Design a protein around this ligand. Structure first.
Ligand SMILES: *[C@@H]1O[C@H](CO)[C@@H](O[C@@H]2O[C@H](CO)[C@@H](O)[C@H](O)[C@H]2NC(C)=O)[C@H](O)[C@H]1NC(C)=O
Lengths: 49, 49
């Protein structure tokens, strides 16, 4: 006999949503990995994606 | 310094009825803690762990 504290009230999620930016172009894998000439280690090349 | 002597006494001729205040705590707040919500929240993986 008595009053017992139990877990707090839970509401379970009903669905799932994803929100990503408006991006359509594909990343330039053919000019970073498939290049004809690479840079030397002392003067390596850095490219912004 | 009180004038102590061999054959002298001090006996009051009037009185004062003084009222003073006194404060004492009796109780404190009753609290409860939900481990799952504090440590994990809504993370099912953390709740399982
Ligand atoms: C009772 O007698 C004593 C002793 O004479 C008094 O005490 C002195 O009081 C005088 C006057 O204020 C002070 O200058 C002294 O420093 C006290 N000390 C001494 C001399 O003992 C006391 O005041 C008397 N009480 C009353 C109510 O007359």
């Amino acid at each position: 006999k008595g009053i017992y504290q139990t877990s707090n009230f839970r509401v379970q999620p009903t669905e799932s949503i994803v929100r990503f930016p408006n991006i359509t172009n594909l990343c330039p894998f053919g000019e970073v990995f498939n290049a004809t000439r690479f840079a030397s280690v002392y003067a390596w090349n850095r490219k912004r994606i | 310094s009180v004038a102590y002597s061999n054959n002298s006494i001090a006996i009051p001729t009037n009185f004062t009825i003084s009222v003073t205040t006194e404060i004492l705590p009796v109780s404190m707040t009753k609290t409860s803690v939900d481990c799952t919500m504090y440590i994990c929240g809504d993370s099912t993986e953390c709740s399982n762990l």
